[PDB]
């Protein structure tokens with residue numbers, strides 16, 4: 001996990017090879033590419049409560065909001081399962097309005 | 110030709126307080142590293158050399 | 160020899176001796192250049208900070224380079240620079256001038272402010288600073304809620320700390336002990352080597368020309384030989400000391416490079 | 428295809444070989460004496476000189 005120790009990027013594994021008076025390592029590393037701009041926001045206000053992502057980050061493609069993992073674009077609908085609540089939307093700098101869908105209420109019908 | 114060494118390229122990453130960039134694809138790269146571990150064992154005798 | 164034909168002719172019989180010394184010293188110089196280039200050159204590009212700076216309340220004016228000053232250095236760099244102060248010996252300039260080193264440092268700092276640790280692996284990816292700090296708290300085991308609720312207090316503490324460190328560095332002396340120590344050691348070694356040039360080593364005089372124009376050759380040559388062996392011994396001693404000190408410096412430089420690669424381009 | 432990718436190992440070998448070469452070459456210096464061969468000195472002169 002120590003950055004740039006063996007490899008250049010995110011380390012996956014390595015292979016050793018002999019050499020007349022030494023050793024040769026082959027490092028296999030993971031390197032991301034094909035970026036894309038997005039608009040973000042630290043937290044989501046809803047019903048007067050603030051929601052934060054359990055693991056991921058909020059993004060918007062222009063009209064809707066999703067949560068993604070930080071290393072690979074894969075949007076998902078914001079739900080009360082991948083977010084947690086603490087406080088009220090009054091002291092965070094940058095919070096934006098939206099609605100958080102939850103499964104139990106539509107299930108109950 | 111003698112010139113002034115160039116440190117590298119030039120860019121200015123677009124910073125703004127509500128904009129991020131997220132990768133959408135990946136690559137796997139294999140690199141090599143080389144390290145010496147030993148040298149030849151030699152031996153010298155005084156009275157023969159001198 | 161000090162420009163004496165007789166000395167050169169006498170010295171010719173000692174075989175290839177100073178080629179060894181020159182090879183060793185060239186190796187030392189190459190090692191120094193490699194050390195600097197390895198420690199600092201670790202980015203493929205040269206980033207630049209945006210003209211408008213609103214990093215969620217943090218303030219890096221003390222550290223960012225100042226275009227007003229001719230050297231494009233910063234406040235702390237200026238403080239550090241200001242605080243710290245022949246017979247064939249030659250000093251060669253380093254390959255990298257100070258401006259390029261300052262430019263590397265500025266590029267590294269701009270990259271780590273704007274992109275976080277992403278630029279260490281691939282292309283730099285922008286990210287608002289507050290969210291980067293939230294990531295970094297989440298790293299050490301504290302929920303990101305805390306930073307978003309105490310951003311103002313955290314920024315104030317950071318600014319106060321940076322001001323305090325600036326003042327402490329400006330006022331308190333004897334903080335840069337190691338660098339001054341290295342400089343003093345090198346200067347003292349050169350000084351004693353050049354001082355050693357004024358000893359008889361059991362000869363009738365310490366100046367070559369007088370020995371030449373006092374005696375006949377068959378008697379002067381003995382004194383010449385004594386001078387030769389004494390000076391050669393002193394030169395060997397100097398070279399060996401330089402080799403030891405260079406090895407130690409290389410170890411220190413390797414440690415510095417590792418620290419900079421691990422504690423700057425990523426959280427540790 | 429590309430060569431010169433193993434500079435470190437070759438550097439080590441070259442340094443060792445060159446050190447041995449200069450050491451063995453040093454055996455041919457008069458060092459201020461009258462000859463660089465011991466057997467010649469033994470054959471020509473007498474011990475007291």
Ligand SMILES: *[C@@H]1O[C@H](CO)[C@@H](O[C@@H]2O[C@H](CO)[C@@H](O)[C@H](O)[C@H]2NC(C)=O)[C@H](O)[C@H]1NC(C)=O
Pocket residue numbers: 061062063064
């Ligand atoms: C942002 O993403 C949303 C979610 O996919 C997009 O909304 C969909 O757009 C497609 C385009 O044909 C429609 O077929 C879907 O019906 C839309 N979803 C819903 C729930 O109606 C939206 O268009 C995207 N916006 C941009 C600018 O890319």
Ligand SMILES: *[C@@H]1O[C@H](CO)[C@@H](O[C@@H]2O[C@H](CO)[C@@H](O)[C@H](O)[C@H]2NC(C)=O)[C@H](O)[C@H]1NC(C)=O
Pocket residue numbers: 093094126127213
């Ligand atoms: C991010 O930066 C933008 C512009 O640098 C800030 O936008 C300003 O927000 C205030 C507060 O509502 C407005 O009064 C200003 O008019 C806005 N500027 C402009 C040019 O319209 C924004 O506040 C910053 N912080 C965020 C978005 O969290």
Ligand SMILES: *[C@@H]1O[C@H](CO)[C@@H](O[C@@H]2O[C@H](CO)[C@@H](O)[C@H](O)[C@H]2NC(C)=O)[C@H](O)[C@H]1NC(C)=O
Pocket residue numbers: 096097
């Ligand atoms: C998010 O929605 C809430 C309510 O739906 C908005 O709160 C209102 O803001 C206006 C403008 O300041 C006030 O006049 C109302 O009294 C507020 N209502 C309540 C219930 O607090 C809030 O402004 C919205 N967020 C944004 C960024 O506009």
Ligand SMILES: *[C@@H]1O[C@H](CO)[C@@H](O[C@@H]2O[C@H](CO)[C@@H](O)[C@H](O)[C@H]2NC(C)=O)[C@H](O)[C@H]1NC(C)=O
Pocket residue numbers: 035036037121122123130
């Ligand atoms: C993301 O948005 C920016 C701004 O809308 C796009 O424009 C780039 O902005 C930077 C800094 O202002 C310039 O250095 C680039 O030259 C701009 N791009 C072009 C094509 O001129 C940017 O292209 C968008 N995409 C990415 C991946 O950053």
Ligand SMILES: *[C@@H]1O[C@H](CO)[C@@H](O[C@@H]2O[C@H](CO)[C@@H](O)[C@H](O)[C@H]2NC(C)=O)[C@H](O)[C@H]1NC(C)=O
Pocket residue numbers: 134135
């Ligand atoms: C990620 O990148 C790889 C290559 O870097 C893409 O794979 C190529 O895809 C194109 C179009 O489908 C093919 O013509 C090439 O032959 C593929 N290359 C290889 C080596 O297989 C891949 O498509 C990219 N990811 C996505 C989601 O498009």
Ligand SMILES: *[C@@H]1O[C@H](CO)[C@@H](O[C@@H]2O[C@H](CO)[C@@H](O)[C@H](O)[C@H]2NC(C)=O)[C@H](O)[C@H]1NC(C)=O
Pocket residue numbers: 218219220221
């Ligand atoms: C960041 O901190 C510096 C402190 O060095 C601020 O610069 C000072 O600003 C005050 C207010 O105008 C001046 O009275 C001082 O003379 C400034 N000091 C120096 C050394 O120039 C700077 O303003 C802060 N950043 C921001 C954005 O306010």
